[PDB]
Design a protein around this motif. Structure first.
Motif, mmCIF file in Angstrom:
data_model
loop_
_atom_site.group_PDB
_atom_site.id
_atom_site.type_symbol
_atom_site.label_atom_id
_atom_site.label_comp_id
_atom_site.label_asym_id
_atom_site.label_seq_id
_atom_site.Cartn_x
_atom_site.Cartn_y
_atom_site.Cartn_z
ATOM 1 N N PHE A 60 0.726 -1.703 -0.088
ATOM 2 C CA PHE A 60 0.184 -0.447 0.367
ATOM 3 C C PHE A 60 0.469 1.350 0.125
ATOM 4 O O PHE A 60 1.107 2.107 0.116
ATOM 5 N N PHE A 61 2.026 1.030 0.140
ATOM 6 C CA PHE A 61 3.333 2.245 0.769
ATOM 7 C C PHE A 61 2.907 3.388 -0.982
ATOM 8 O O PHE A 61 2.351 4.152 -0.841
ATOM 9 N N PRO A 62 3.236 2.662 -2.192
ATOM 10 C CA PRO A 62 2.649 3.521 -3.606
ATOM 11 C C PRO A 62 1.198 4.084 -3.250
ATOM 12 O O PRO A 62 2.223 6.121 -3.087
ATOM 13 N N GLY A 63 0.560 3.655 -3.148
ATOM 14 C CA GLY A 63 -1.006 4.427 -3.324
ATOM 15 C C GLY A 63 -1.057 5.926 -1.816
ATOM 16 O O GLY A 63 -1.311 6.693 -1.986
ATOM 17 N N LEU A 64 -0.177 5.416 -0.840
ATOM 18 C CA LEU A 64 0.100 6.369 0.696
ATOM 19 C C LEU A 64 0.933 7.402 -0.476
ATOM 20 O O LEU A 64 -0.237 8.462 -0.299
ATOM 21 N N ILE A 65 1.447 6.881 -0.709
ATOM 22 C CA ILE A 65 2.324 8.480 -1.086
ATOM 23 C C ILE A 65 1.681 9.385 -1.794
ATOM 24 O O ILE A 65 1.560 10.554 -2.090
ATOM 25 N N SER A 66 1.226 8.960 -2.934
ATOM 26 C CA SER A 66 0.437 9.406 -4.088
ATOM 27 C C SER A 66 -0.828 10.028 -2.796
ATOM 28 O O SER A 66 -0.954 11.132 -4.124
ATOM 29 N N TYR A 67 -1.449 9.576 -2.180
ATOM 30 C CA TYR A 67 -2.423 10.374 -1.638
ATOM 31 C C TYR A 67 -2.301 10.997 -1.258
ATOM 32 O O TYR A 67 -3.054 11.983 -1.014
ATOM 33 N N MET A 68 -1.040 11.134 -0.412
ATOM 34 C CA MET A 68 -0.755 12.289 0.381
ATOM 35 C C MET A 68 0.169 13.629 -0.119
ATOM 36 O O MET A 68 0.867 14.387 0.224
ATOM 37 N N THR A 69 0.499 12.815 -2.178
ATOM 38 C CA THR A 69 0.305 14.662 -2.669
ATOM 39 C C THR A 69 -0.482 14.917 -2.953
ATOM 40 O O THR A 69 -0.551 16.096 -3.786
ATOM 41 N N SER A 70 -2.063 14.365 -3.365
ATOM 42 C CA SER A 70 -3.333 14.974 -3.930
ATOM 43 C C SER A 70 -3.627 16.404 -4.069
ATOM 44 O O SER A 70 -4.519 16.677 -4.161
ATOM 45 N N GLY A 71 -3.053 16.958 -2.353
ATOM 46 C CA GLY A 71 -3.554 17.871 -1.960
ATOM 47 C C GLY A 71 -2.187 18.820 -0.916
ATOM 48 O O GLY A 71 -1.703 18.051 -0.429
ATOM 49 N N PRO A 72 -2.184 19.624 -0.276
ATOM 50 C CA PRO A 72 -1.466 20.490 0.821
ATOM 51 C C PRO A 72 -1.667 19.736 1.810
ATOM 52 O O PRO A 72 -3.173 19.641 1.949
ATOM 53 N N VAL A 73 -0.540 19.687 2.518
ATOM 54 C CA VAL A 73 -0.968 19.916 3.501
ATOM 55 C C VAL A 73 -0.802 20.404 4.898
ATOM 56 O O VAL A 73 -0.566 21.650 4.605
ATOM 57 N N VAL A 74 -1.145 21.096 6.129
ATOM 58 C CA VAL A 74 -0.705 21.928 7.292
ATOM 59 C C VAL A 74 0.563 21.292 8.366
ATOM 60 O O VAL A 74 -0.652 20.093 8.929
ATOM 61 N N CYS A 75 1.644 21.435 8.445
ATOM 62 C CA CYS A 75 2.319 21.313 9.351
ATOM 63 C C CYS A 75 2.020 21.748 10.209
ATOM 64 O O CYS A 75 2.321 23.568 10.653
ATOM 65 N N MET A 76 2.143 21.038 11.376
ATOM 66 C CA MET A 76 2.447 22.058 13.302
ATOM 67 C C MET A 76 3.736 21.179 14.111
ATOM 68 O O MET A 76 3.096 20.228 13.762
ATOM 69 N N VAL A 77 3.627 22.547 15.055
ATOM 70 C CA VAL A 77 4.938 21.669 16.175
ATOM 71 C C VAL A 77 4.025 22.383 17.273
ATOM 72 O O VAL A 77 3.896 23.208 17.236
ATOM 73 N N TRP A 78 3.730 21.486 18.225
ATOM 74 C CA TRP A 78 2.880 21.710 19.283
ATOM 75 C C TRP A 78 3.630 21.169 20.608
ATOM 76 O O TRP A 78 4.413 20.705 21.037
ATOM 77 N N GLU A 79 3.763 22.224 22.004
ATOM 78 C CA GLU A 79 4.320 21.696 23.193
ATOM 79 C C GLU A 79 3.656 21.796 24.340
ATOM 80 O O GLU A 79 2.866 22.575 24.191
#
Lengths: 153, 153, 152, 158, 153, 143
Positions: A60-79
């Motif tokens: 399922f890895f190739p499909g996962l990577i494809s899905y994860m590049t299909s739209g933008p993400v929001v990255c955060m760090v919480w403390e």
């Protein structure tokens, strides 16, 4: 040092598409966790492949990577204290169908592959993920005015 | 070309301290506007002095810059029809004591100097501000699943 | 007489697609207005063409009708003093770009052609609309437990 | 099909009286479940007597029927993967005093006899309930714009 | 008689400082519990020492009392069936890190020493707490319009 | 300036309709400071002075009495409540969001600083006012 624990939280492409960015941020912000880094990104496959390095080779890895590049993400760090584990409890179980009402996945999701958000699974994983997605210069040091009311001295 | 319009929205240090990042994002996200850039930053005084260049030489300018460097800010770019003017209507009047209930400043603020958020005042300002705070590589190109339901054909 | 005024409120296909049904209902329900009829429906073109009769012949008309049949709508009748006018205020101006924050359209939409909801423009209009969209047997008579606290 | 599973959700007279219609809808609507039928109704005792067919004979039965005819109800059909079971979970336990914070009953109810809402207990019961409360003509099919973001590619698609 | 059960709920100083008074009230109010007494107070150490009588002698006791006098509290009495037990379940576990999302502490708290709210642990302690913090003249007798819809009679 | 206070009271209909939390929220979230709070069943005499059929409704259930502190809190409080007449009030205000009848308009707010000072001293004793400093003061107000 305990209050300095950090975790990496990412709103996946489905979270962005479904207009859930503010809701994910709200769960952490209202809890007293401190936002120390934030960015919207369209990562390329190479970055995502390292993020998910432990899953390489799986069918399922190739499909996962494809899905994860299909739209933008929001990255955060919480403390904050125990933020890795608490972060995970707030997201819910990995599978939305096993997540309880009151959690992000339990309130908003149905399919495990469309579970809107990622959170680090351990402090060690968090440290790896934070350095992967952010440079040290992007992490913003600050002191909350409510610190003495969120934490015991 | 009207749907392509963009505006720069920035949560000021007081908005971050008071835990209103999620609420500012919500007002735009729920309205159907598209988030295309987002970051938390601790800008230096030189970037803020250019952002506020038209106020240089006013007696309050030094205090404004010091204040704007007193905590991190959240920088955003939103896209959609008339977003500059609508963004300003959603924020409320500059002065919270003149802002109506239902607006961000009217709901959450009291002092003009602690008015939690900035929005571009005009298309000309927005274009300048977007390119001041973000490089083109930080702007995310994407198509919302709800596009055809937010916009007429 | 006053308290028995009724208006027709309809979540349009974009309102349904965008998951705003609960929010439209909340604005009226929390205000103390009484829901007396409710249904999700996929109206046929003949009903929509009667609803929009004054627009028939405009270049955009066939497109409006096809759009209004492109997904289901949610039809409601609300009852209470001055509900037609108060309902229109709560919806905001017909044109979302002219609608204030705090109103449904001011909060949730952008284009007049994707303005999520309709409300009757007057009591005259409401009477017509309610008769077109609902049968009298679909109207539910009831008395709210909070009546004496909503009304003097 | 899996994604086509449906459940019957009904806001009871107390839920309507207490102004909780919007909140019940919200729980399902925000989750990505699809509303495919909806109506407010003042059902006859006989429809309710059939809905609670298997409670006939109980001493509380006449009382239950009278209570369920004491105000209008809101009838709904929701569609999506595992909607029957997830619907029940979102409602909380039948008994509000056993329901957790975050569920409808745990957030809004106290008494089991005033527990604001009903959800089908199984797929079998859901199909029975949908057929009893709605005609096939009242079910309004549609495809959500957000489908591909709520669901992954479905399995065994013909 | 069971519908007449009462509990004492108190927003602690951190809950007041963090702007959580409305949220605590909401959890009880929306559930159909009846508010019968309410006041903001800055109690004397003497009242708090009796409230926390079971903790006398603990090494942290003096620090707890000085903390509990560091800002005002909001005192409440709520009435309805099983309100003592349900009230505690709504607050969450004593420890926020063990509290589930959906509960007050699980949603808003991190440190057990800054856990925003107190609820009586039993009917017996509730009766003691109510008479300690309120006079009978401060308890308001009324009947909710929604009584017949919240309770089966 | 920042020490201005206003008197806000949730009327019996506001309590009955479960709106106490929402009235408090509008002020709390705005950065105003709650300095006094109590639920009370005032007698006819306290009510007659306050208002120097109405007295009957106003004694038909409890009220919630509040004092809020902050810059321009009298005027901003009135704005947040909305116009006296709910049918004249805008969405976003308390009466425009929750009310229909002027005689069931859920809340009262002082109309002026002078009225506020009078109302606060009528409904609360000095000992009931709780002074404190908000941790967010420097982020709500400019020095």
């Amino acid at each position: 040092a305990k209050q300095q624990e950090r975790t990496y939280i990412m709103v996946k492409p489905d979270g962005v598409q479904r207009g859930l960015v503010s809701e994910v941020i709200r769960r952490f912000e209202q809890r007293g966790y401190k936002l120390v880094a934030l960015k919207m990104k369209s990562p390329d496959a190479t970055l995502l492949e390292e993020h998910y390095a432990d899953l390489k080779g799986k069918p399922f890895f190739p499909g996962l990577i494809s899905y994860m590049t299909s739209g933008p993400v929001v990255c955060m760090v919480w403390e904050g204290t125990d933020v890795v584990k608490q972060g995970r409890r707030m997201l819910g179980e990995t599978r939305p169908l096993e997540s309880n009402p009151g959690t992000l996945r339990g309130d908003f999701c149905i399919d495990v592959g469309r579970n809107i958000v990622h959170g680090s699974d351990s402090v060690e994983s968090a440290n790896k993920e934070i350095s992967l997605w952010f440079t040290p210069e992007e992490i913003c040091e600050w002191t909350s005015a409510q610190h003495k009311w969120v934490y015991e001295q």
